[PDB]
Amino acid sequence: LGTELDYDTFCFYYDWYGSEAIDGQYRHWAHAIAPDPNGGSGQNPGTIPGTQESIASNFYPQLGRYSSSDPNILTKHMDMFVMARTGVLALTWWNEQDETEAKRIGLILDAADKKKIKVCFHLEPYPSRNVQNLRENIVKLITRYGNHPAFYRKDGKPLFFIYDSYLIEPSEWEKLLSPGGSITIRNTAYDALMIGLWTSSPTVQRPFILNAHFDGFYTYFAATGFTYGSTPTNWVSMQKWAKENGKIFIPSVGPGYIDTRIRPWNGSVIRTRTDGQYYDAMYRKAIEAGVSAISITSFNQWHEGSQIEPAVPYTSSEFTYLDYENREPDYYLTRTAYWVGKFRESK
Numbered sequence: 001l002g003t004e005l006d007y008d009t010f011c012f013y014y015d016w017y018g019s020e021a022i023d024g025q026y027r028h029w030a031h032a033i034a035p036d037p038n039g040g041s042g043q044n045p046g047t048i049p050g051t052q053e054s055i056a057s058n059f060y061p062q063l064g065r066y067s068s069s070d071p072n073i074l075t076k077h078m079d080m081f082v083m084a085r086t087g088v089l090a091l092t093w094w095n096e097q098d099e100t101e102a103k104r105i106g107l108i109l110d111a112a113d114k115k116k117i118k119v120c121f122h123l124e125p126y127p128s129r130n131v132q133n134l135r136e137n138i139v140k141l142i143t144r145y146g147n148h149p150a151f152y153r154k155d156g157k158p159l160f161f162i163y164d165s166y167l168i169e170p171s172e173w174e175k176l177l178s179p180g181g182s183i184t185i186r187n188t189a190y191d192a193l194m195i196g197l198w199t200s201s202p203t204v205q206r207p208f209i210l211n212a213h214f215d216g217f218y219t220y221f222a223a224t225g226f227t228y229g230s231t232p233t234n235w236v237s238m239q240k241w242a243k244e245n246g247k248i249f250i251p252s253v254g255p256g257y258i259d260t261r262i263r264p265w266n267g268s269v270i271r272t273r274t275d276g277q278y279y280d281a282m283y284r285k286a287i288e289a290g291v292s293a294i295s296i297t298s299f300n301q302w303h304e305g306s307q308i309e310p311a312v313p314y315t316s317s318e319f320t321y322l323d324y325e326n327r328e329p330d331y332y333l334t335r336t337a338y339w340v341g342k343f344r345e346s347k
């Protein structure tokens with residue numbers, strides 16, 4: 001029918017939103033404003049309070065200041081994934097080690113399974129992250145969630161994305177990811193496809209990925225040109241290298257970027273949506289590169305204005321929000337479905 005989910009399409013999902021009613025605080029809708037890293041000492045940038053009128057986004061959610069732990073919001077999000085045809089929810093994971101995290105992960109898996117959506121984990125740069133506690137955490141996540149019907153596998157293996165994987169030396173990664181490594185996961189119950197973050201130039205990233213024994217790489221950033229890896233004119237050559245070296249390239253595409261409510265000094269990274277034309281151009285480049293899998297930045301990174309989740313026009317006494325302009329609130333979901341179709345036609 002051209003409506004089925006695609007299980008090689010990964011959409012980055014954030015579960016860090018709170019409401020006073022459910023979480024005791026409108027978590028993340030309230031957010032600190034970052035000081036300007038070039039702007040000198042004694043800045044008092046303040047905070048966005050997460051009131052109805054003033055939230056930590058340049059856009060405004062159709063669903064309002066929602067809780068990521070509200071089962072009724074989760075239902076709606078899964079129906080949005082079905083509309084977008086995105087079969088894998090790539091869940092931010094911060095190793096909070098608290099009952100609230102454990103509850104929310106279970107609720108997300110349960111809601112996903114009702115709609116045949118799958119869940120994989122996006123392993124964030126949590127405090128003191130290293131290959132030993134990464135192994136322990138991979139073991140824990142596979143043990144706790146690996147038998148859940150919504151847990152993702154690709155050809156029998158779990159898949160993890162590793163954000164800011166460059167913060168760990170290749171010599172450490174080798175211990176975890178080479179078949180001969182001291183603490184290897186290869187050939188164990190806990191083996192997985194490990195997808196590292198390709199940032200800078202090939203002279204740096206090619207030996208990094210090889211020496212670290214990653215199974216593949218992704219690029220994350222929604223803003224074209226932010227890094228070498230997030231410059232789509234490089235994607236044909238990145239794919240050629242991947243294929244020559246037995247690696248899985250999962251380029252990241254997004255609909256735009258803007259984070260100036262929380263980073264007022266970061267305007268150079270703004271990428272305008274142009275009624276969908278930015279998203280179309282980036283998704284076309286991914287497909288043309290001939291890749292096997294695509295990642296989407298993001299479902300709901302509202303702070304960075306990369307979300308495909310529905311947004312609505314809103315002007316409050318405190319801020320005039322951006323919105324989807326000439327397009328309807330669900331335009332980026334239905335346009336994602338269009339591109340998933342073009343991607344499948346290519347596979």
Ligand SMILES: OC[C@H]1CC=C[C@@H](O[C@H]2O[C@H](CO)[C@@H](O)[C@H](O)[C@H]2O)[C@@H]1O
Binds near residue numbers: 092122124262303
């Ligand atoms: O998921 C990978 C990566 C994507 C974007 C931002 C990163 O989080 C940091 O920035 C946000 C604001 O946009 C903060 O709310 C988080 O606390 C930061 O860690 C995220 O790691």
